[PDB]
Structure 1
Amino acid sequence: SFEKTPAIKIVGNKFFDSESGEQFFIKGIAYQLQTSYIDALADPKICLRDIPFLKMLGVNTLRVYAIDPTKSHDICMEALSAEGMYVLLDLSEPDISINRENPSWDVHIFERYKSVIDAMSSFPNLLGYFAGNEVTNDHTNTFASPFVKAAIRDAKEYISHSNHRKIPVGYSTNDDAMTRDNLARYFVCGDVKADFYGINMYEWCGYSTYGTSGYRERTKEFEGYPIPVFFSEFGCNLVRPRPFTEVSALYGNKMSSVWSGGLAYMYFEEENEYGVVKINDNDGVDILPDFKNLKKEFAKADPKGITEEEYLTSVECPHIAVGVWEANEKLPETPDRSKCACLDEILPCEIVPFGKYEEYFSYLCSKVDCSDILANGKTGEYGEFSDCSVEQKLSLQLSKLYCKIGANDRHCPLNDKNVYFNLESLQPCKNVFD
């Protein structure tokens, strides 16, 4: 039973408890142990150790960056519900993410997102999904953001055309001044919109103020923004112990009318000095001085919200400007698993997954036309097979060189142990093919 955590819903630019009608404010902390990620919410001994410490801290929300969808989460998710706690969840993992330097929206990443959605959507205390975290981070990689918008669209589509509660799908961004307005506008522009928007906000350092930190200016620029907005991370570590005086500002009357709260970064201490606890060699919890300051600030924080009943009584995309903003409004298409699966059956020359990609793409794309696998977020040109996996794309180009050479001897023209002749290509899915 999840009675202590009714589903939160979005109306306009605010969160609301769907059963009480009261506005929901996030008082959170990031909770991530550093598969090749660790999924503490799949390990009862870890989460049941930490939840009593989370309870003392006074949080109602965790941010989790990676779960293993092949594992069960009901024990930890029920234990969290018992203490009134919700989860914001990233859909990616470290090795399956939109790469900001070479962005793609493809079958491999989309399948990861779906699996996470399938693993976690039955939990009423799943607050929301992040389709991206700081993908575009400065003016040289804004062309990554159309790939993220496509991911939001396709994630929302897949949630929509399914049996699940319509869990909102949003985005988490950094705080680079040259890109931040454009990013905010881009994610609510056109036909595809994020459902909510978190900022990783570290502008308030030590004993700062509302007027000197930048918080006032941020608050004024997000006032009237059409979707819920909050601090997906906060807790600058200039001075230590961290005072967390930003918490008083965040949940004060001025900021609580714009921001839906925030999540401190983070629970575990991990060589970066951001923890509120340290895990000892016994695997027990040692409370750090930060914990008490955060605890005391969250306890004082009493945001003045509005009831849903009371609250009840598309925008232009940024222009393209070279060097500054280069995110095309035209998005890549929904990746097609069945179409890309056909390459595995028909292609003469295949390569098993691996530095070598960049090397082997440079090589093959000098000998054959690679337009069919390129994805360009600046111009909105996406090749026919640009949604396929990193290996299928490479296999296609190698197979193209093989046929162009014409030898027809089953010698694939690239010397590498991962290259092999595909015997399935001699057999008679879809003749739609190339």
Structure 2
Amino acid sequence: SFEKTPAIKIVGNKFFDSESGEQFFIKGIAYQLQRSGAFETSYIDALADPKICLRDIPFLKMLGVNTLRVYAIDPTKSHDICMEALSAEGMYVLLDLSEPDISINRENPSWDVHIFERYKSVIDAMSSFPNLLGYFAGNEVTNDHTNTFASPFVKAAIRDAKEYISHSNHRKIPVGYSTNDDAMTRDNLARYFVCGDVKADFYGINMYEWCGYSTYGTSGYRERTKEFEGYPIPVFFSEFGCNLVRPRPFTEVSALYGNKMSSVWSGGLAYMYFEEENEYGVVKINDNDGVDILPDFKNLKKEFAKADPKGITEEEYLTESVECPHIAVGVWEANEKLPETPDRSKCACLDEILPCEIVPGKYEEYFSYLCSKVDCSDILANGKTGEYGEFSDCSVEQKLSLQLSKLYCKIGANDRHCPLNDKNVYFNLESLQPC
């Protein structure tokens, strides 16, 4: 049963409960364990472990939240026990598709079969749950004026995740983006993610401008609210909770759900549940695996309890592409033109037919070496100029194998000797069998 969590849908720039027709406001907290790793994943998936999630849900209920943000799940594990238990308390999940070792690399961005496969894996693991509120296609990928060229890759990922869901049998869970709050980039980022032919479904900002006993006017919240007025998709704080002043009073919550902000914003999620030596938690897990409540907890609880946002109904609400920011060197360098959808079968053909292959700092050395001997244009991807090589969507190993093979063919010995000395290099006997 998921009767306490009917699926949430989007209409215009608001979220609505698909049964009641009432506007849905997010009252959230981030929920993610870390470690500080071959046989285990780098990330920990608390939603795959009933002993963890079932400990914490009663405390989450006490806080009064209706949403969690989860940054990483292991798609190979089951999640129904934890998802059902969250549903029984009226709780929804916002979920990042990426994970620390499979994300769009903001300093060398690609949108490729390896990252797309991760995204699909997550979608297929999690889309059966009606309380899955939405997916994030990226978190703070572009984060300042020196890496704006990563943003076309994120937009391609939004497009392709949405299309994969569209063509699947799943409920059409919306796909959005979570951004940081860098002054030089924020307006251009927000416009970029709703410009042209591909749009985010919703937009989360990780918002830390309000610290201590601040006010609507002095925090920056009034000016942010003014700038997002009329933005065409739902907008919310995907993180909040500046810890400059402790214990956090969380008085920003009174502003966020007040009349002035509730007409623009769809709520927000505090960062975060667990205390991890970063002074950001509201509970600390002791050496006996019990929950010890920290001084922030009561303050967040009290603020969420008093929050009573006045929205509008789906029926009363119901009664031209936006231009992409222009390019200026050192300010904004995200091309409107996006990379193509990664093509697993084209790329899988390299695995089959190439004479010389490599099994997955060697990449830098090897690309530098091979790309002085053959033309690597076919694997380059440039988000500034909107020029994406024919094989730029393949995995890094496939890309290196392609270049190695070109060098092998260029030499022309035909003696099965691949021209790079490394234990990971091998001649592919399938290349001999008569893509």
Name the TM-score, length of structure 2 as normaliser. 0.98
CA deviations 1:372-416 (Å, max 9, x no partner) are: 000111111110100000100001111111111222222211121
Cα offset, 1:421, TM superposition: 1.3
CA deviations 1:92-122 (Å, max 9, x no partner) are: 1111111001111101111111111111111
Separation in 2, partners of 1:421, 1:41: 43
Separation in 1, partners of 2:334, 2:397: 26
CA deviations 1:253-312 (Å, max 9, x no partner) are: 000110000000000111111000101111111100011111111111111111111111
Report whether the alignment pairs 1:151 with 2:176: no
Separation in 2, partners of 1:423, 1:101: 36
Cα offset, 1:208, TM superposition: 1.1
Cα offset, 1:161, TM superposition: 0.8
Name the TM-score, length of structure 1 as normaliser. 0.98
Separation in 1, partners of 2:393, 2:423: 25
Separation in 2, partners of 1:273, 1:409: 61
Separation in 2, partners of 1:301, 1:178: 32
Moved more, 83-92 or 305-314: 305-314
Moved more, 179-188 or 399-408: 399-408
CA deviations 1:114-153 (Å, max 9, x no partner) are: 1111111110000000011100000111110000000000
User: Equivalent residue for 1:12?
Assistant: 12
Separation in 2, partners of 1:402, 1:255: 62
CA deviations 1:217-245 (Å, max 9, x no partner) are: 00000000000000000001101111111
Separation in 1, partners of 2:140, 2:406: 36
Separation in 2, partners of 1:136, 1:31: 24
CA deviations 1:319-377 (Å, max 9, x no partner) are: 01111111111100010000000001111111111x11111111111111000000111
User: Equivalent residue for 2:37?
Assistant: none
Cα offset, 1:184, TM superposition: 0.2
Moved more, 122-131 or 420-429: 420-429
Q: Any idea what SS the aligned residue of 1:243 has?
A: coil
User: Equivalent residue for 1:176?
Assistant: 182
CA deviations 1:142-185 (Å, max 9, x no partner) are: 11000000000010001101111111000000000111000000
Indicate the RMSD between aligned Cα atoms, in angstroms: 0.7
- For structure 1, the 5+ residue unaligned runs are 430-434
Separation in 1, partners of 2:92, 2:373: 53
Separation in 2, partners of 1:253, 1:358: 53
Separation in 2, partners of 1:121, 1:144: 27
Separation in 1, partners of 2:251, 2:45: 31
Separation in 1, partners of 2:164, 2:326: 30
Separation in 1, partners of 2:186, 2:378: 32
Report whether the alignment pairs 1:341 with 2:375: no
Q: Percent identity?
A: 100
Separation in 1, partners of 2:305, 2:365: 55
Moved more, 400-409 or 71-80: 400-409
Q: Any idea what SS the aligned residue of 1:23 has?
A: coil
CA deviations 1:194-237 (Å, max 9, x no partner) are: 00000000011111111111111000000000000000000011
Cα offset, 1:83, TM superposition: 0.2
Cα offset, 1:420, TM superposition: 1.3
Q: Any idea what SS the aligned residue of 2:323 has?
A: coil
Separation in 2, partners of 1:198, 1:122: 23
- For structure 2, the 5+ residue unaligned runs are 35-40
Separation in 2, partners of 1:407, 1:179: 52
Separation in 1, partners of 2:289, 2:421: 48
Separation in 2, partners of 1:176, 1:364: 38
Separation in 1, partners of 2:404, 2:211: 53
Q: Any idea what SS the aligned residue of 1:24 has?
A: coil
Cα offset, 1:7, TM superposition: 0.4
Separation in 2, partners of 1:419, 1:118: 33
Where does 1:271-290 land on structure 2 (aligned, <5 Å)?
271-290=277-296
CA deviations 1:21-43 (Å, max 9, x no partner) are: 11000000000011211110010
Separation in 2, partners of 1:291, 1:410: 65
Separation in 1, partners of 2:365, 2:223: 46
Separation in 1, partners of 2:306, 2:364: 53
Q: Any idea what SS the aligned residue of 1:366 has?
A: coil
CA deviations 1:62-113 (Å, max 9, x no partner) are: 0000111111100000000000000000011111111001111101111111
How many residue pairs were aligned? 428
Where does 1:307-386 land on structure 2 (aligned, <5 Å)?
307-313=313-319, 314-353=321-360, 355-386=361-392
